[PDB]
Amino acid sequence: MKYKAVLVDFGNTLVGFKPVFYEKVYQVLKDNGYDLDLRKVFRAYAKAMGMINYLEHVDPKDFLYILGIYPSERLVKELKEADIRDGEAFLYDDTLEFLEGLKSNGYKLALVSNASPRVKTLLEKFDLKKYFDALAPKIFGFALAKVGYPAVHVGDIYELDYIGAKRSYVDPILLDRYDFYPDVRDRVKNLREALQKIEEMN
Template identity: 30%
Template sequence: MRAQWDPRQIRAILFDAGNTLIFPNYNKLRQSLAKLGIFIEERDFMLAEYRAKDKLAKVLKTVGEDAHPQPLILYFDVIFHEMGLPEADLAKTRELVNSRGTIAELFNNISPSTYTTLKLLQKWGYILGIVSNADGNLRKALDKFGLTPYFHFIIDSKEVNYEKPDPRIFFLALERAGVQPYEAVHVGDIYPVDVLGAVRAGIFPVLVDPLGYYNDLDCLSIKSVDELLTLFQKIF
């Protein structure tokens, strides 16, 4: 995959949303869980999420090519299960996630530098798009956080009825961007979903890996989207 990388050819940058641009507010989740008698450290959330990513990808494959009906509930269910919580506590976490319900409620932590990064990439002339496995509320969340103006298009898996790693969702992104596969990169955080999905569509993948969990994998990785500026600024 590394051999295909030529930043001079890139015209479009595609982004995953959750854990790439917007992140769970672990502190608020911890506070809500504590009220239910479930006590979890913030770092335990992050580590469990890492361990759960591959398992999540396998679960997504079992539901076939169509989008999972409740991807957020599935996402958090796999994470809490990975923490080893007893079934009684898992039931409480499901109820909590159900009560919060949407991406905007569960993912509301954004680094200020993300806005700067997107603004510069946009200024440099890149076509920016989002390709996300979401719940139909992604646009509302992006509007709420002021991210929508940075993107030429937003693809929510719930709206198109198939999700990553299905290459069709990437082909749709290429069509909307008006570029060929070799002219695009996709930036996301789940290797089997974002990296392998992009590769299946002929798109160069960039893995967001803040803890260096995937250092042994043969793909380009960054700790945050801010590092995209380093990758592309030499062209200008």
């Protein structure tokens, strides 16, 4: 096997996030002239999940920032009314299957992520921890060294890694669940496709 190891991101990769009252958030954006469907809402909301200064609770200005939308006095008010700070995590359908599949086909797996206490809880909750040979910023290269290389990084926007001597030790796969990167090809839209690309790659 060319690739010993797969590194995987957390949000928009294994686990999604949405506001609890997503249909209300959807309706507020639309009322202010941004008709986006719910995939676009969920994409941005999981990114906003990462900018919260640590009890999860996204800030509505961060969510607009990720969306490229200007923080109207009013929009922000209506989003607060919509209870945007209350979110939920959900597991993608294909996640357990993907992880089990890679593991049982001889790959070592590392998780690459930020907010450890929240992420730990959710790893516990969805019973994802058992799959990982390493949990990983600079804990990155320790994780990489542990699981071995060359490795493949599956991510929703972790993009290109830069550990290595002559050559990058990590080749990326862009996983785009929400059709946000139509101008990137070689992208995959779910972890079935991601597994097939991995298999093609070696």
